Amino acid sequence: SDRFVIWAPSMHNEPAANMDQLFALDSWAHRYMNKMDVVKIENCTIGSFVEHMDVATYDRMCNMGFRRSGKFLYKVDPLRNCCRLYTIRTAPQELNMTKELKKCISRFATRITSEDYCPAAVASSDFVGKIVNAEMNSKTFYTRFEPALYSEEKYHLFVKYQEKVHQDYNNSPKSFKRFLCDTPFGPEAVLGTQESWEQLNNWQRMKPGEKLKHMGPVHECYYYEGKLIAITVSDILPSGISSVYFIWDPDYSKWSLGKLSALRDLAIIQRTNLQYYYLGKANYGAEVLDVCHSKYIPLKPIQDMISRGKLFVIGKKKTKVTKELYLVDSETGRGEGFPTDNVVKYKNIAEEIYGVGGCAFKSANESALELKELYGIPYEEEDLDTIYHNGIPNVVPGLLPLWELLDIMQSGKITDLEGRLFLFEIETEGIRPLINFYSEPPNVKKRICDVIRLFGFETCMKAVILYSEQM
Numbered sequence: 491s492d493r494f495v496i497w498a499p500s501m502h503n504e505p506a507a508n509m510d511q512l513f514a515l516d517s518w519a520h521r522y523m524n525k526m527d528v529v530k531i532e533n534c535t536i537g538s539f540v541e542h543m544d545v546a547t548y549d550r551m552c553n554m555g556f557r558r559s560g561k562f563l564y565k566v567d568p569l570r571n572c573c574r575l576y577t578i579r580t581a582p583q584e585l586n587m588t589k590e591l592k593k594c595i596s597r598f599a600t601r602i603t604s605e606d607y608c609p610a611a612v613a614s615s616d617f618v619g620k621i622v623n624a625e626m627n628s629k630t631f632y633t634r635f636e637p638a639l640y641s642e643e644k645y646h647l648f649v650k651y652q653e654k655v656h657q658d659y660n661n662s663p664k665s666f667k668r669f670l671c672d673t674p675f676g677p678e679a680v681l682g683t684q685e686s687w688e689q690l691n692n693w694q695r696m697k698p699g700e701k702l703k704h705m706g707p708v709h710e711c712y713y714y715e716g717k718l719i720a721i722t723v724s725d726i727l728p729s730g731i732s733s734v735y736f737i738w739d740p741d742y743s744k745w746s747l748g749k750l751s752a753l754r755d756l757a758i759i760q761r762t763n764l765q766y767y768y769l770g771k772a773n774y775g776a777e778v779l780d781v782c783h784s785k786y787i788p789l790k791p792i793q794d795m796i797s798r799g800k801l802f803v804i805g806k807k808k809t810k811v812t813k814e815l816y817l818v819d820s821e822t823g824r825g826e827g828f829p830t831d832n833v834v835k836y837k838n839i840a841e842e843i844y845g846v847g848g849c850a851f852k853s854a855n856e857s858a859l860e861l862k863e864l865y866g867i868p869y870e871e872e873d874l875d876t877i878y879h880n881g882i883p884n885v886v887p888g889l890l891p892l893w894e895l896l897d898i899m900q901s902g903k904i905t906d907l908e909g910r911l912f913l914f915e916i917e918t919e920g921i922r923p924l925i926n927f928y929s930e931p932p933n934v935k936k937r938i939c940d941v942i943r944l945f946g947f948e949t950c951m952k953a954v955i956l957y958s959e960q961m
Contacts, residue, residue, distance in 0.1 A: 492544035492676075495914075495954040496563075498937040499538040499944045500961070501882050505572075506533065512572045514801040517846045522878060530879045531572045536886065537564025538944065540674035541956060545705040547949065548674070549727040550823035552577065554946070555781045555888050557770045558725075558734065560672040568781065568887045569844050570877065574799050577779040579730070579766040579786060579825075582756035586775035587615045594749050599624035601745075602631035602714075618757040622694045631714050633754075635690045637681050638707040638723065640671045647718055647737055654740040670709075670723045670735055679706030690726075696761050702726065707734070712747070720747050724755065729825060730766035731755055766825070772796065777827070780804050781888030782815045782843075784822035787836075794838070801887065804828065805839035813853040814843060814891035819947045844887060851875070854884040857892035865899050865928065867935045882940060890943040898947070910951045911938065916958055933959065 509526055513519035522529050537556075540563045548558065555565045555577045568574050595617050599609070603624050612619035625631065645666050652658040673680055686704035689696070705726050712720035720738040724731050733755065738747040752767075759767055769776075777786045778795060782803045794800055805811065828836070843850045851873045858869030869892065872884050884892055898904050904927050913934065914921040927935065937957055941950045 491952075492547070493542070493912075493954055494547055494945075494949055494952050495540070495542040495956070496941070496945075497539040497541065497956045499536065499882065499940045501880070502535045502537065502564075504533050504535060505531075507572060511798060514569045514571070514574055515841055515845055516800065517841060518877065521846055528879075533573065534567050534571050535564045536567055536882060536889075536944065537562050538941075539563075541954075542676065543674050545675060545679055545725075546728055548725065548732075549729050550949070551945070552727065552732050552768050552823075553729070553779070553825045554784055554823040555779055557732075558674065560668050560670070561674045563674070565781075565888065567883070568801050569885070570883065574801065575770065576795060576799075577781070578769045578774075578776050578789070579779070580756070580769060580774065580776040581766055582618060582760040584775050585617075585756060586773050587617060588773060591617070591749060591753065594746050595620050595753065598745070598750055602628040604629070617753050618760050621754055621757045622761070626694050631712070633691075634711045634713065635687060635708050636711065638671055638673055638709050639680075640667050643718055644709070644711075644721060647721060647739065650740065651737045655738075673707045675706050682706065690762075693758050693761050696763070698763060700763065702762050702764070710751075712738075714742075719745075720751065722751050722755070727764075727768070730759055730764045730768060732768040733770060780828075782817075783828075784817065784824070784888075785826050785828055787828045791836075801840045801844065802838050803840035803843055803887070804836045805842075806834060807837045811839060811842055812849055813893055814850045814885070816894060817890050817946075822946050840887075844885065848885075850885045850891070851877070854892045857896045858884050861892065861896055861899065865935070866932050867899075867939060868932045869936070869939075882943075890946070895939055895942065898942070903947075907938065907947075907951060912954045914954055914956045916956070921954065933957075 510519060510523070512531060513522070540558070540561050548563070551563060556563050557565065557577075566573065566575050592614060599620055607624070607627055610619075610623055612623060640663070645663050648666050648670070649661045652661050682704050690702065690704050690708070705728060707723070707725050710722040710724065711718060712722075718739070719742055720736070722736050723734040725734060736748060736751055738745075752769075756767055759765070774789055777788045778792065779786055780803065787804055789796065792802055794802055803815070842848070855871035855874060859871055861867045861869045869884065877885075908924040908927055911924045912921055913924060927938070930938075934957070937955055938950065941953055941955060945953070
């Protein structure tokens with residue numbers, strides 16, 4: 491119910507990255523296989539600076555394909571970007587325990603507990619039981635959940651990690667605050683109450699039926715023998731836990747703290763009566779997000795993402811598509827799965843839609859021309875062909891197709907935003923209501939349309955769009 495106060499969405503450029511794998515579809519790689527020198531591959535990021543939102547909204551956004559960097563809620567263009575990141579969720583009950591993970595957990599339980607540790611008879615695959623049992627019977631290792639706030643030792647460990655692992659030496663305390671301490675959440679969501687922190691710290695002792703009181707960003711600090719060894723920046727969501735970033739002492743590369751942190755997060759999710767883990771290699775037993783449906787499909791049948799990471803739109807063979815897939819408001823971001831019938835041998839229709847001869851492109855150009863000509867919204871035909879050589883493209887998988895936006899305009903559904911959506915120009919002495927959409931300036935119209943396309947229509951109904959007319 492909390493208002494969704496955001497800046498107008500934009501597209502940012504951070505280009506820093508075997509020349510045959512950086513394409514999201516095989517046909518576009520084939521078309522530009524010999525012209526790689528003239529292709530302008532950039533590392534794009536479509537997002538929006540969020541000024542305030544509640545935890546439930548960010549949960550919905552995760553289930554729409556979003557991740558946050560500080561206050562910047564973003565997603566990558568899964569068709570044009572050099573790196574396609576997939577929103578993948580994992581439940582602790584459905585995780586494929588490999589042999590390396592079992593060795594990791596065994597060595598962990600051996601190093602944290604004394605030699606006098608007589609272990610229980612927990613199964614070799616119940617990693618949650620081993621983690622909880624060994625960590626409760628250990629006097630050398632512990633963790634502490636605490637608010638996402640700045641401290642000098644946290645920043646020092648951050649710098650050491652960044653420079654010895656990621657080889658990044660351009661780190662300042664402002665960047666650490668702005669990336670791992672600044673959050674778009676309320677003061678309760680960040681700070682909370684001491685009682686909720688005591689509950690979350692006793693997650694090993696939580697019994698089924700008991701609910702987490704705390705929902706918001708947290709820092710889990712790993713302490714071994716009094717020394718800070720790792721920090722897990724994560725978001726406690728109503729549906730689970732979303733990992734934002736992970737930091738670990740390089741001197742402890744013996745521990746494989748990334749795998750250990752993932753397994754411990756799964757153990758927490760199971761004990762804290764949460765369901766999913768939002769990761770954001772080879773064998774998982776997890777399920778990824780089809781953004782064109784905003785629905786999750788298991789990852790085993792989809793070997794193309796596991797092998798090449800190229801795009802994938804699920805569909806049926808006996809159905810031919812004419813335009814991009816309709817996004818159903820009130821179901822996008824709800825974590826809905828695909829039916830588990832194996833008779834419908836779902837094919838990949840991503841090439842039919844976003845490929846070279848894709849229908850999405852002509853449909854979007856025609857819809858954009860019609861929008862600009864009939865309603866004064868500044869859309870231009872862009873990808874008449876050659877999707878590789880500012881603003882936001884007319885065809886992006888996971889965004890609301892332009893024909894749906896045109897239907898919203900034609901059906902008069904757009905008038906449902908007026909009286910609900912509020913706008914905030916900083917230089918106008920105040921926040922103002924939306925009285926008439928069609929009488930707004932064209933740039934304001936396109937900002938509202940970008941919010942609708944990127945975050946959904948029902949979310950835009952409860953939004954507050956901040957804008958200045960200098961960008």
